[PDB]
Amino acid sequence: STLANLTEVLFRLDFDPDTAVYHYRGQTLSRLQCRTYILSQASQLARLLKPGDRVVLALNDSPSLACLFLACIAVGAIPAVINPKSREQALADIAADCQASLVVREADAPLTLRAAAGRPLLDDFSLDALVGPADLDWSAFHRQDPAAACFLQYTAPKGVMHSLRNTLGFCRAFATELLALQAGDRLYSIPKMFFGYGMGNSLFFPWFSGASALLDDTWPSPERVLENLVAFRPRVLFGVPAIYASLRPQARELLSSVRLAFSAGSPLPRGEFEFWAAHGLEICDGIGATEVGHVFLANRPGQARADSTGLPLPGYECRLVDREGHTIEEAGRQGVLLVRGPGLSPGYWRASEEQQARFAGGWYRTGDLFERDESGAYRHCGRE
Ligand SMILES: Nc1ccccc1C(=O)OP(=O)(O)OC[C@H]1O[C@@H](n2cnc3c(N)ncnc32)[C@H](O)[C@@H]1O
Description:
Number of strands: 20
Enzyme class: ligase
Largest sheet: 9 strands, mixed
Bound molecules: 5'-O-[(S)-[(2-aminobenzoyl)oxy](hydroxy)phosphoryl]adenosine
Radius of gyration: 21 Å
Protein name: Anthranilate--CoA ligase
Number of domains: 1
Catalytic activity: anthranilate + ATP + CoA = anthraniloyl-CoA + AMP + diphosphate
Structural class: alpha/beta
Distance between the termini: 38 Å
Number of helices: 12
Strand order of the largest sheet: 2-1-10-9-11-12-13-14-15
Organism: Pseudomonas aeruginosa (strain ATCC 15692 / DSM 22644 / CIP 104116 / JCM 14847 / LMG 12228 / 1C / PRS 101 / PAO1)
Family: Belongs to the ATP-dependent AMP-binding enzyme family.
């Protein structure tokens, strides 16, 4: 295969550079603005990090987080985004697990750097003081095997490795094949970027499909969410079942903007589906897993059904194994869901033999019990 770099590949996708990519605190950044900032920042990270060094980013959602993440990748570093409110020992355990060279935290608290106070639109994270001002026209991307580890996603937390190949893989299946996101689409993800679901929705899909995403550094209280819906008016809403439960009293405001409502994280109850169907809003339930990059099995827009997880996305293969390890062919018979496909991770960054056994045989063992109906659609039935 030909060596490549995930940030460079995204930067080369054919979309208008003057269009929005990120929105933050009432401001908007274009693809061009972030691209310029990412290259400048990369020129500084290259003075600090050698290719392969790990970086832990314990930051609230913001354009600077997304861009710093892409700047790490540009120079060949391997970033991980974790909950900024992690306990001290939890942050330490993660940095030790990936042997990180650099941790970047919020203000006031490996080498540790801090964001500025005041929530600026763009942040230098003290790099100007640490390594000096940026180069003007940096482009020294670190290109590598497309199957090699590019960044980590931690889900005892284990670090899931994601590569250039399977990242573009899960983007294609979900953003393109399932949702058919169009350039200019406005996206709003309630889950944050330290969640695999949020990282895809907010960080990657804007670059991948020419869309733009609202980023919010505050926690998603239902009143904060409602504010954002009316200020931003997204076409696509990435939610979870409890969120839609909390949005019932505001159905009018929701349907005024949201045209594609997605739900992931846990099974969407039939009651929630039918309530919003009665109001004329289709909630598409889909399942993803960190070890699979993003959503791999979902209700297709315009064809969703209640109490169902839908059909495997294009390119994915789903299998059900019974308690003796045999593949289940019959419908209405529960088994453990195994999955392979474009988004499948190459494995955990650091793990025991038993931990890596989740990836045994070229499949990811979800640990979810599922059943298939006569048409091939899946239905969540609990955990093993
Ligand atoms: N990482 C993700 C990327 C995209 C979208 C979600 C995720 C995500 O949740 O990743 P995680 O690794 O935290 O958890 C995966 C596990 O969560 C459960 N689950 C998620 N979605 C559903 C659903 N629709 N219906 C039923 N169960 C679901 C299921 O137990 C699964 O094994």
